[PDB]
Design a protein around this ligand. Structure first.
Ligand SMILES: [Mg+2]
Lengths: 212, 250, 233, 235, 240, 231, 222, 244
């Protein structure tokens, strides 16, 4: 698994791989690791697949109840804290999660919270979680600027997952891209890593270590 | 089933009276006379053994009860209510004191616990008040000898001497004339027997009178020797013969 | 969680053209000690069902009491208790299977393996298995413990698939069952010579045979076997 | 005294019948169902001019496809709305779909008879529940404190209900447009209200398949009131 | 546990225990709330039947629920403490979970919910209290003023009064308060609030309390002398 | 009088008035008919509307593939009791792989209603039920009263004016019991039976509700144009 | 110490077509090296044009299917006989599985049917309830033997058009029901050859707009 | 069933009054008068025992004045047994606060807690209220010397001088007449005794019919001392102030 999310001028970019493994056996290459909590909020999948799926669609229900009761969009701060407070109740029982709750509201602007199954809740600009997180961080840290364009930011997220997919044995399949704006998230397609690798190699001149 | 009486059965009336407590005091007034007198070196409590039938063995019915080795109790009013209160009083002396401090409670604090139980039957759901007034006599190291009265409301007062029940009004007047702060225990027993004779109609002897004292330590009633600090109970119930001996010098 | 103490070994069974047959020996073992020699492990329920039980005997006696109570309960306010609303083999099995799975789910199992054999109202043969884990399955032949390893191969040579059932008579089926019980006595160290056998037929009903013995045993060839390799005398 | 769950000699529950009397004292609410949508309208009835009338909330959203109007002891409706919202959201969580309008109504009505010696008394409020689903289209239900609910083509509840219902009897037909229904609710509310109807003492809302549940702006309703006045003066 | 249904319907569709709780509110000392363009003022009556009172330590009539919201009341004093405590706990709970202080409407909706619950729960009687809840939403400069009552209904008010003789002071407010132009300053708002109480109070001495709440958690209680200056100026204009 | 304040009080003549008042709620309810042959069992129910804008209140509830009932009285109480039947039918299938006998279903309903007639705080159920079903002993029809009394019958009717339909069935007894293997004729007899209880109003397409269960027929409810054939 | 879990073997396979769906599974049930049954049905018709299989520990598998069938029954009771759509069934099964998150059903679940547009649908679950819509999914013992073959022959992975040499992929043309069944049979025939727990028989349930049909085929019994 | 016998202790009258609270207050008006007076250098608590006897052991007797902790004391008017239940609860609350914060409980916080307990019995539970009114005399370092009262309704208020029990109307008028803000403890002692002497229903005010207590910073340097007066000490202060 490799999942990332970063804040920038145009909002938030969320990028994930698609691979699921059981030991060495590749169970799936078509896993949806971005959970669409609602049209305005996104969550990433890392650790336990069920724990992340179940509790983040549950989170979507709690967010829907909030805006029905309060007649106002829930803040990313409040949404992330509902999830972190819930998993903290289960601490010790064996839940496995590492997720980024991503949103863009009026009062906050673009906001990302890293939420963890041992109770951690961190606000931040760049987060990267999974077995291939270190590879993606390298590409992110050396190319990140606040004043990236939407086009360039989308590519940076795509390229960072590709870096992890190449080196990390347990990451790969395809790349899913999302762009989170104040008016909601926009899906930017599924990109097969096999085809993407060769395309990027030729156009970018990178991966000279690999014969093509 | 389930106890569905979770509400108070004792409530304030428009005049501010708590009816059920007043009615409980009326039941005490109908009860047989009992009294208590405090001396310099002891306390005496006494009552009449009003036998319901001559076929009944009145020695098997104890109106004067040991609560602790140094504390005794007598009553006027409803006998069954007294019996269960003695059971509860004996247990609470252990659970809320002896099992904590390793010694028996002082008279005033045991009285306080009994009072609390009687107060709760005046406010708790689905119960009536206890229909008794208690007289509790006792001794403890730091407070010396003492005598207390406890009423159905839960209120308690310390006395030099007093009486409750049937002929209490006349008995209290008799005690006011005879009591002084220089009385020895034998003088107090003599006065107790004189006072009790006035409220008794029929036979007046050791078999119809129940009398106990809180006095000197009785090492002969301890049941064991070898521990110098344990010197025996101060509570002692007088025998039928011991009462009759003092009725000749009456 | 516990451990079985007093235990019973294999239960074996098969279908034939008009019904089912089931069998089990009469031993209650205490580890390697062959402690109790008169234990009945086939328990009939009505005239259409026989429940065969292996494993822990204390738990077997408990199950026996549950089945006895089930018959009592079914008769309550039931005018057709001995007719249309009598207990079916399928009802008895499903109840036991429910109990077994519930008990394993509380981490306190009934340490048994059970085979329910019987004939339904419409004449259909019933044969199904359940164990301490709540696992269930059906087959033309069924056996527990050692029986699974040694009896099934022999019984499957008679009825290999569904289409072999109408071609198998009650004489051929009983013969196969009796032979399997002999083989188990030769080869299972926790088995006994004495056993019980039950036939449930759609025409002739329930036939319960007690105090059967393994007979026609081959032992004579033992006299020629000497040493473990080189010894001649 | 006497039990809270006692039957009368006529076979009716005293407390339920008495709560129905409290609902008769409530402000009027009207609903009309068409093939183009369902309209909901209420009388606000402010007790004083200093009371800011837009804080009077007698029309409420349950979900995107279900709305609700109330009449009677309106404080009692809050826990009913809470339950309805929770039931709608919970079903979506369990089944990844919208809940049927009838099923939502049935869930609310299950609360009604949970009183005794649970809550100490029945609810003193009636609800008009309107919505849309794929199976049965546009629907309007009337939920009572008895636990009973009826489906209606059109329905009025509150103090002016029997006069309004007679009017709805004559005016409703199966070919009504949404615009025709809006004017019809306004017309009948104006008829039964004590004070003169305007955009501040009355409120409109609707539920359509496309746009979902919407409470109308005071500016939008004001235009429909002006359109009503002119067409009544047209003959 | 005690489960008796004390609040029940009557044949005419009334719940008498809730209606009798309103009668307890009618007996309580008068409270008034007025919102200006950039403030809200809460005025309260102190009955002068009690002198030899220690005013330093005696419970004050206006209570802070949070740094930005206040609550005043009319009715049973002991009952009001229970609602105030619950509201204060909920205010801190909201900050803890939502990471934002309560809106005035939310806090009102909570207190009103508690009051409603005590009208259809077994073994309990309704609160003999009506409240005025005032303040400013976080990062908002629009004044807020709400009212609750024993039944549990609540609503927003440009100006409102509760308690004894509240019919009289509401009469005053209805003719003196203009919606198109509310009291533009703190002075004008306090003046209109003191004026409204002077219709009912008696002596303008230690009988009138005034608390001013402004945006961004700016809450202050006026002293005797400061209020006395308003009392003086009002009657000197009246002598004409 | 002085003895009708609660269900825990007998009158001096040994009557339970709260139960009798609950029985009265059934008499106010709309008429429903039940009848059976040896192959099928039928429910016919006259649905009641609030007014011309309103729907007609549903009267028939399915409990299982082989069992269901019709109601008359407090509808929410029928929902509670039918839910209990659904659970009991379900428990029988899941635990014992057994379809619940109609007679045993009656016994369970009797005992559930009884507990509400002997305890303080509660109240009797205010609804009557007609249960039809096909089990291992053929077709069955039951009548439930909230007193607890459950009765097995060839035919019956409950609700307002139910006496007319009950007399008709008492005459036709020998004819309709013989209608085997002909569902349409058995329903015709039920529609003709419920017609003996109508006044001023007649059976229309949204007025009539019919249910049937039989040998090779799962419990199915007919409403709308599906009953026009029988009007 | 008591072990509440076991392994009954078995292999299942679900494929979604353009206007159909198949769910197949072998009929062999085992423990360790023994055969319990040569014909023990593992794929079930659950009503509403939905087929289901829960492979792994058979006791948990039977329990789950039983509870879902029950959920379909109560969905009809509670929601006016509304047809339970395949997506709604999937979300419901997640909640059944996650309900035992800390004492899981030891099974791999697959359901098949048609979506609300009439197109073929397959959903796949892990033991604790995480799920995904998929085109092609094998489960159980021989899943690792079957999936790579399906990647190649259904999705045409690693196949390119002759003459172009890697430049143009083989186009993903739609498969008929006859074509899918051929691939299912060959998948299980190959799995039978190389996996000891696979054999005896193959039962396929086919789902179309017309309903649910069954097909049975013999497998090697060794 | 049981409903028949329920008095319904927690209901409003048509006028919006709590029946049981009103009737409990009527009970308290017959109890012995208790007075509290607050001065700049301390607080005085004076109270009258109800018609006593010569055979009552006075030196070991306590019915009016109780110690809650080293800084706070109470005067009781009403049912003594009801008061002791609440007194023990208050003593525990004070110790809970001291354990939690390692500081002595502020006077008002203790008073609010006891008053809230009284309030509960008027709103839920169906039980009779406590027939007790308290006068709280106490000191803390926030507000200094403080006097409070609470009654069965659970309402509490602060005072410079206050009376509870019998003849409060007459007593409060006498206190309102002679009380001044710059008053000292020795002057307050005299006022309290003079007020009781005039309002008493007895023929004369003697030592055996009184309980007396002072809370003074007349403890060696910045600390507070509670003094529950002995029978002989009450006799001396009666001679000093010229009442006997
Ligand atoms: Mg093989």
């Amino acid at each position: 698994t490799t999942t990332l999310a970063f804040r920038f001028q145009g909002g938030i970019i969320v990028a994930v791989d698609s691979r699921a493994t059981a030991g060495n056996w590749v169970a799936s290459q078509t896993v949806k690791k971005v959970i669409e909590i609602n049209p305005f909020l996104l969550g990433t999948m890392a650790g336990g697949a069920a724990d992340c799926q179940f509790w983040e669609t549950w989170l979507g229900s709690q967010c829907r109840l909030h805006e029905l009761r309060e007649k106002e969009r829930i803040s990313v701060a409040a949404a992330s804290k509902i999830l972190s407070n819930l998993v903290y109740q289960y601490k010790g029982a064996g839940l496995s999660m590492g997720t980024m709750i991503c949103g863009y509201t009026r009062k906050e602007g673009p906001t990302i919270y890293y939420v963890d199954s041992d109770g951690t809740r961190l606000k931040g600009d760049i987060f990267c979680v999974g077995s291939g997180q270190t590879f993606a961080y390298g590409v992110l840290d050396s190319n990140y600027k606040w004043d990236l364009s939407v086009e360039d930011a989308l590519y940076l997220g795509k390229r960072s997952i590709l870096a992890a997919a190449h080196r990390d044995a347990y990451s790969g399949g395809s790349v899913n891209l999302y762009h989170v704006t104040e008016d909601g998230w926009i899906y930017h397609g599924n990109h097969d890593v096999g085809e993407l690798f060769w395309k990027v190699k030729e156009e970018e001149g990178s991966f000279n270590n690999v014969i093509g | 089933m389930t106890d569905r009486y979770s509400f108070s059965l004792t409530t304030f009336s428009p005049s501010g009276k708590l009816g059920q407590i007043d009615y409980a005091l009326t039941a005490v007034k109908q009860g047989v006379t009992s009294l208590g007198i405090k001396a310099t070196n002891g306390v005496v409590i006494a009552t009449e053994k009003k036998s319901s039938s001559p076929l009944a063995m009145s020695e098997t019915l104890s109106k004067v009860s040991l609560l602790t080795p140094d504390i005794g109790a007598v009553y006027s009013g409803m006998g069954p209510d007294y019996r269960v209160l003695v059971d509860k009083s004996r247990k609470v002396a252990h659970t809320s004191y002896k099992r904590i401090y390793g010694e028996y409670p002082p008279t005033k604090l045991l009285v306080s616990e009994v009072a609390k139980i009687m107060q709760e039957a005046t406010q708790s759901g689905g119960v009536r008040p206890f229909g008794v007034s208690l007289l509790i006599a006792g001794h403890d190291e730091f407070n010396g000898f003492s005598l207390y009265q406890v009423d159905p409301s839960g209120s308690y007062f310390p006395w030099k001497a007093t009486a409750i029940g049937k002929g209490s009004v006349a008995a209290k007047t008799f005690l006011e004339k005879r009591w002084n702060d220089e009385l020895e225990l034998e003088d107090a027993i003599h006065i107790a027997l004189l006072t009790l004779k006035e409220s008794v109609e029929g036979e007046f002897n050791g078999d119809t009178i129940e009398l106990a004292i809180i006095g000197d330590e009785n090492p002969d009633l301890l049941g064991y020797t070898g521990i110098p600090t344990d010197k025996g109970p101060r509570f002692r119930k007088l025998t039928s013969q011991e009462i009759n001996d003092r009725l000749e010098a009456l | 969680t516990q451990q079985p103490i007093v235990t019973g070994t294999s239960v074996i069974s098969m279908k034939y053209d008009n019904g089912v047959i089931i069998a089990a020996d009469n031993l209650g073992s205490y580890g390697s000690l062959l402690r109790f020699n008169g234990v009945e492990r086939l328990i009939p329920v009505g005239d259409n069902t026989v429940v065969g039980i292996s494993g822990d005997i204390s738990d077997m006696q408990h199950i026996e009491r549950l089945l006895k109570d089930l018959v009592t309960e079914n008769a309550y306010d039931n005018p057709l208790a001995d007719a249309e609303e009598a207990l079916e083999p399928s009802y008895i099995f499903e109840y036991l299977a429910t109990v077994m799975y519930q008990r394993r789910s509380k981490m306190n199992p009934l340490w048994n393996a059970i085979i329910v054999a019987g004939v339904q109202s419409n004449g259909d043969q019933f044969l199904r298995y359940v164990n301490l884990l709540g696992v269930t399955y059906s087959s033309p032949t069924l056996a527990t413990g050692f029986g699974a390893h040694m009896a099934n191969p022999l019984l499957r040579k008679v009825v290999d698939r569904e289409s072999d059932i109408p071609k198998t008579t009650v004489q051929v089926a009983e013969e196969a069952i009796v032979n399997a019980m002999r083989v188990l006595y030769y080869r299972d160290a926790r088995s006994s010579r004495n056993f019980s056998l039950a036939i449930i037929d759609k025409n002739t009903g329930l036939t319960f045979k007690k105090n059967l013995q393994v007979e026609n045993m081959k032992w004579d060839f033992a006299k020629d076997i000497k040493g473990y390799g080189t010894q001649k005398i | 005294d006497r039990g809270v769950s006692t039957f009368s000699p006529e076979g009716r529950l005293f407390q339920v019948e008495y709560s129905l009397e409290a609902i008769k004292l409530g402000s009027t609410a009207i609903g009309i169902a068409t093939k183009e949508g369902v309209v909901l309208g209420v009388e606000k009835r402010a007790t004083s001019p200093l009371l800011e009338s837009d804080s009077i909330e007698k029309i409420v959203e349950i979900d995107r496809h279900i709305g609700c109007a109330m009449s009677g002891l309106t404080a009692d409706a809050r826990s009913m709305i809470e339950h309805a919202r929770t039931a709608a959201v919970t079903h979506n969580l369990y089944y990844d779909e919208d809940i049927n309008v009838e099923s939502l109504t049935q869930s609310v009505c299950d609360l009604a008879l949970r009183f005794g010696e649970l809550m100490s008394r029945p609810f003193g409020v009636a609800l008009l529940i309107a919505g849309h689903d794929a199976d049965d289209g546009y629907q309007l239900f009337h939920a009572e404190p008895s636990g009973t609910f009826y489906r209606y083509n059109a329905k009025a509840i509150g103090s002016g209900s029997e006069g309004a219902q007679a009017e709805l009897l004559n005016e409703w037909h199966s070919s009504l447009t949404l615009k025709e229904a809006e004017l019809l609710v306004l017309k009948i509310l104006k008829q039964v209200m004590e004070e003169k109807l305007d955009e501040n003492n009355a409120q409109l809302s609707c539920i359509t398949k496309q746009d979902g549940f919407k409470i109308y702006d005071n500016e939008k309703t004001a235009e429909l009131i002006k359109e009503l006045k002119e067409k009544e003066a047209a003959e | 546990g005690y489960d008796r249904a004390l609040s029940i319907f009557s044949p005419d569709g009334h719940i008498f225990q809730v209606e009798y709780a309103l009668e307890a509110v009618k007996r309580g000392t008068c409270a008034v709330g007025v919102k200006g363009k950039n403030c809200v003022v809460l005025g309260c009556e102190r009955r002068s039947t009690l002198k030899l009172q220690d005013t330093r330590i005696t419970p004050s009539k206006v209570s802070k629920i949070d740094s930005h919201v206040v609550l005043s009341f009319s009715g049973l004093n002991a009952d009001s403490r229970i609602l105030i405590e619950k509201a204060r706990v909920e205010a801190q709970s909201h900050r803890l979970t939502l990471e934002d202080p309560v809106t005035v409407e939310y806090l009102t909706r909570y207190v009103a919910g508690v009051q409603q619950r005590y009208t259809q729960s077994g073994g309990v009687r309704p609160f003999g209290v009506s409240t005025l809840i005032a303040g400013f939403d976080p990062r908002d400069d629009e004044p807020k003023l709400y009212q609750t009552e024993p039944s549990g209904i609540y609503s927003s008010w440009s100006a409102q009064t509760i308690g004894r003789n509240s019919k009289t002071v509401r009469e005053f407010l209805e003719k003196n308060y203009d919606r198109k132009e509310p009291p533009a300053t703190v002075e004008e708002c306090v003046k209109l609030t003191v004026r409204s109480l002077l219709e009912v109070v008696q002596t303008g001495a230690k009988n009138i309390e005034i608390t001013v709440v402004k945006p961004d958690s700016d809450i202050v209680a006026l002293s005797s002398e400061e209020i006395n200056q308003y009392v003086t100026q009002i009657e000197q204009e009246k002598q004409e | 009088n002085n003895y009708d304040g609660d269900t825990v009080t007998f009158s001096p003549t040994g009557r339970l008035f709260q139960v009798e008042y609950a029985l009265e709620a059934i008499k106010q309810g709309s008429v429903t008919v039940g009848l059976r042959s040896n192959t099928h069992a039928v429910l016919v129910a006259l649905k009641r509307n609030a007014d011309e804008l309103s729907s007609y209140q549903k009267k028939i509830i399915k409990c299982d593939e082989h069992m269901g009932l019709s109601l008359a009285g407090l509808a929410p109480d029928a929902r509670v009791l039918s839910n209990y039947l659904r659970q009991q039918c379900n428990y029988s299938s899941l635990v014992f792989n057994r379809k619940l006998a109609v007679e045993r279903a009656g016994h369970l309903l009797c005992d559930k209603a009884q507990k509400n007639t002997q305890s303080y705080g509660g109240r009797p159920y205010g609804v009557g039920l007609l249960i039809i079903g096909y089990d291992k002993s053929g077709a069955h029809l039951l009548e439930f009263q909230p007193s607890g009394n459950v009765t097995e019958l060839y035919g019956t009717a409950i609700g307002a004016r139910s006496q007319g339909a009950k007399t008709y069935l008492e005459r036709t007894l020998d004819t309709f019991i013989k209608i085997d293997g002909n569902p349409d004729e058995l329903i015709k007899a039920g529609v003709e039976a419920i017609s003996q209880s109508l006044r001023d109003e007649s059976l229309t397409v949204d007025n009539l509700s019919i249910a049937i269960v039989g040998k090779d027929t799962p419990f199915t409810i007919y409403d709308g144009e599906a009953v026009a054939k029988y009007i | 110490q008591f072990n509440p879990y076991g392994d009954n073997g078995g292999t299942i396979l679900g494929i979604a077509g353009e206007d159909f769906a198949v769910l197949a599974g072998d009929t062999r049930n085992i423990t360790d090296y023994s055969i319990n049954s040569r014909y023990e049905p593992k794929v079930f018709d659950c009503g509403d044009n939905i087929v289901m299989s829960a492979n792994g520990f058979a006791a948990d598998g039977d329990a789950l299917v039983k509870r879902f069938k029950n959920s379909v029954k109560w969905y009809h009771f509670d929601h006016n006989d509304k047809k339970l759509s395949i997506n709604s069934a999937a979300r419901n099964i997640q909640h059944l599985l996650y309900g035992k998150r800390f004492f899981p059903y030891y099974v791999h679940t697959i359901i098949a049917g048609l979506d609300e547009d009439g197109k073929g649908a397959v959903y796949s679950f892990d033991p604790v309830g995480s799920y995904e819509r998929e085109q092609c999914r094998a489960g159980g013992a021989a899943a690792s033997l079957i999936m790579p073959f399906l990647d190649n022959q259904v999705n045409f992975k690693n196949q390119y058009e002759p003459g172009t040499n890697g430049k143009v992929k083989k186009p993903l043309k739609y498969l008929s029901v006859e074509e899918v069944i051929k691939l299912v049979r060959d998948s299980f025939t190959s799995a039978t050859e190389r996996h000891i727990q696979v054999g005896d028989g193959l039962e396929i349930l086919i789902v179309t707009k017309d309903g649910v049909r069954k097909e049975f085929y013999e497998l090697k019994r060794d | 069933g049981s409903r028949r016998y329920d008095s319904r202790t927690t209901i409003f009258s048509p006028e919006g009054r709590l029946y049981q609270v009103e009737y409990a207050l009527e009970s308290i008006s017959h109890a012995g008068t208790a007075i509290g007076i607050m001065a700049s250098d301390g607080i005085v608590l004076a109270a009258e025992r109800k018609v006593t006897s010569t055979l009552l052991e006075q030196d070991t007797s306590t019915e009016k004045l109780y110690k809650l902790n080293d800084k706070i004391a109470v005067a009781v008017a009403g049912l003594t047994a009801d008061a002791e239940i609440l007194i023990n609860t208050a003593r525990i609350h004070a110790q809970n606060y001291l354990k939690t914060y390692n500081e002595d409980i502020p006077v008002e916080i203790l008073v609010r807690r006891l008053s809230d307990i009284k309030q509960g019995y008027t709103q839920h539970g169906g039980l009779r209220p406590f027939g007790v009114s308290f006068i709280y005399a106490g000191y803390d370092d926030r507000y200094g010397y403080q006097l409070y009262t609470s009654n069965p309704s659970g309402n509490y208020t602060g005072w410079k001088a206050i009376s509870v029990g019998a003849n409060t109307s007459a007593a409060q008028t006498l206190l309102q007449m002679d009380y001044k803000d710059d008053m000292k403890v020795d002057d307050a002692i005299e006022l309290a005794l003079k007020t009781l002497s005039k309002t008493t229903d007895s023929s004369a005010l003697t030592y055996d019919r009184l309980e007396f207590a002072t809370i003074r910073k007349g403890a060696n340097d910045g600390e507070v001392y509670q003094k529950i007066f002995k029978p002989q000490e009450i006799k001396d202060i009666l001679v000093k102030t010229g009442i006997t």
